[PDB]
């Protein structure tokens, strides 16, 4: 009823052809057509994408199925799992991510599902945020276990800074290939986030002092003492960032590895 009155009219096979099933998710099934097409909470997802238009957010085009811009570079997931990123490369991705979060938070929107799987890359090195299926001071236990802030896990009145935590977990993936406790169960991971809070790196000695600082400001247990997207954009670590072209050899490596 509300849904039909938002979505455009017509057969979703009248405007688009060459349907090649690229991915599969719990949310739906992602196809390519160049555009990308997927097939109460579904209403919230569409409206959020329409009103919050930033170059650091995957551009929403139309609905009937959802139609978006196609980012040929793939997901940050293949880069974090198949390649080794240098600190400059990690800083470049973090800066673009905080630029997406800054824009969302300022416009009073919490993402709640920040992870590498929701980071799409352009063939030019562009870093863009997607999946607003979970977006919303707040009190519902929503997200992906391994990326959830402890206050979300423990069922406390959480805010926009929960996205800063998951970004800190996403920095761990960039370093190690996986979020902390990925070997464990999603349920075991939940107990571990609540009981341990700040996760440890397997090899912190390998990181620089600024990168160790940026990580501790993303993963601070005290919400007030944890950084905001505005605060972290001016961080020392973000100054060592590389141009976004430094990410295109990473994209080339992930394509070759996942073939």
Binding site for ligand IPW (CB under 6 A): 22-23, 30, 36, 38, 58, 66, 68-71, 74-75, 120, 130-131
Closest CA to 224 of 164, 168, 170, 167: 164
In this structure, how many other beta carbons lie within 10 angstroms of the beta carbon of residue 195?
10
Residue 256 CB, nearest approach to ligand IPW (Å): 14
67 vs 171 by CB, closer to ligand IPW: 67
CB of 170 to ligand IPW, least distance (A): 17
Distance between CA 253 and CA 79 in Å, rounded? 8
**Residue with Cβ nearer ligand IPW (45 or 220):** 45
Instruction: Encode burial over 39-48: b for 16+ CB neighbours within 10 A, e otherwise.
Output: eeeeeebbeb
CB of 56 to ligand IPW, least distance (A): 14
Q: How far is it, in rounded angstroms, from Cα 250 to Cα 206? A: 20
Nearer to ligand IPW, 59 or 228 (CB): 59
Assess contact for 177 and 80: CB atoms under 8 A: yes
Output 60 or 214, the one with its CB closest to ligand IPW. Answer: 60
CB of 119 to ligand IPW, least distance (A): 11
Minimum distance, C-beta of residue 47 to ligand IPW, in the bound complex (Å): 12
Please name the residue ranges forming H helices in 58-201: 76-82, 87-106, 150-153, 162-176, 186-196
Residues 6+ apart with CB under 8 A from 75: 116, 117, 118, 119, 120, 121
Q: CB-wise, 32 or 228, nearer to ligand IPW?
A: 32
């Amino acid at each position: 009823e509300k849904l039909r009155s938002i979505v455009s009219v017509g057969d979703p096979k009248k405007k688009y052809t060459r349907f090649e099933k690229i991915g599969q998710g719990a949310s739906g099934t992602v196809y390519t057509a160049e555009v990308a097409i997927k097939q109460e909470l579904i209403i919230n997802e569409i409206l959020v994408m329409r009103e919050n238009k930033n170059p650091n957010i995957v551009n929403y085009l139309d609905s009937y199925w959802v139609v978006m811009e196609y980012l040929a570079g793939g997901s940050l997931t293949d880069v974090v799992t198949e390649t080794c990123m240098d600190e400059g490369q990690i800083a470049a991705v973090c800066r673009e991510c905080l630029q997406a979060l800054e824009f969302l938070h300022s416009n009073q929107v919490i993402h709640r599902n920040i992870k590498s799987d929701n980071i799409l890359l352009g063939m030019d090195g562009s870093v863009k945020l997607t999946d607003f299926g979970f977006c919303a001071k707040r009190s519902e236990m929503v997200g992906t276990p391994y990326w959830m802030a402890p206050e979300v896990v423990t069922r406390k009145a959480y805010g926009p800074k929960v996205d800063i935590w998951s970004l800190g977990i996403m920095a761990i993936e960039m370093i190690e290939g996986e979020p902390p406790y990925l070997n464990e169960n999603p349920l075991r991971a939940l107990y571990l986030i609540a009981t341990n809070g700040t996760p440890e790196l397997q090899n912190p000695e390998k990181l620089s002092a600024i990168f160790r600082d940026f990580l501790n400001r993303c993963l601070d247990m005290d919400v007030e003492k944890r950084g905001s997207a505005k605060e972290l954009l001016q961080h020392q670590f973000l100054k060592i960032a590389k141009p976004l072209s430094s990410l295109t050899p990473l994209i080339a490596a992930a394509k070759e590895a996942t073939k």
